[PDB]
């Protein structure tokens with residue numbers, strides 16, 4: 001097959017040129033399979049910090065590769081599609097952050113890791129879907145500014161009991177807007193299945209689910225839940241990751257959900273990336289120094 005030629009050439013070039021391939025959980029299965037590591041954005045960035053290699057091929061979207069770069073400034077990070085981006089992250093702007101800082105100067109700015117690097121330079125702390133509840137609990141203030149996802153922010157408020165001011169207006173991920181009627185229909189079909197949905201899902205979806213977790217948390221649930229069948233309310237790429245990790249279980253998509261920007265990465269342009277060793281992720285040194293502060297603040301709170 002043309003794919004078998006591509007995979008062979010990819011593995012050949014990545015060994016010859018000293019590249020470690022890091023793929024996000026939402027990449028196509030063919031790219032997850034040729035990666036050295038598959039995980040969420042913070043997992044991949046922290047994994048890179050342990051590598052002796054100085055070259056990384058990242059398969060995801062731009063804020064994730066930049067996150068790798070921020071925590072690994074001396075490594076060459078390349079991406080195969082430089083336009084792979086996150087529309088939810090791009091809806092939050094420096095102007096909106098400063099507008100709300102001025103309206104509420106006592107409320108720390110908590111920025112979901114899903115954010116532009118420029119916005120990260122303006123945050124008081126960064127958080128992931130997994131650690132957002134704990135990060136906000138540990139902050140002194142009972143009021144926080146949170147962005148750029150309103151559903152994760154409102155979930156944090158439910159769990160912490162703190163006041164969470166979300167920016168921008170209607171900040172959301174289109175991939176996770178499942179219908180709660182899909183949970184009703186799937187519990188009829190699989191009455192003993194466990195339903196796991198992302199915290200980015202709307203509240204009626206989260207409230208009808210057995211678990212609410214990020215992708216990193218979804219793949220630890222079968223370690224403590226013996227259920228044969230799990231229904232997954234996140235992007236379709238996680239089904240492949242889950243089935244590969246727990247082949248003795250069945251994983252059913254709540255609905256078919258595809259992030260188009262995640263699907264911009266293919267075998268073809270991944271091969272092109274290794275052939276040309278482009279496109280390198282470059283940030284201004286000042287952006288790296290500034291964005292590190294809210295990231296280090298998150299490590300300190302979590303540890």
Ligand code: SF4
Pocket residue numbers: 061085086087088089114173174175176235259260261262
């Ligand atoms: S799945 Fe949603 S949050 Fe993730 S990159 Fe795509 S649009 Fe952004």
Ligand SMILES: [Cl-]
Pocket residue numbers: 043
């Ligand atoms: Cl982990």
Ligand SMILES: [Cl-]
Pocket residue numbers: 071072073074075
């Ligand atoms: Cl480095």
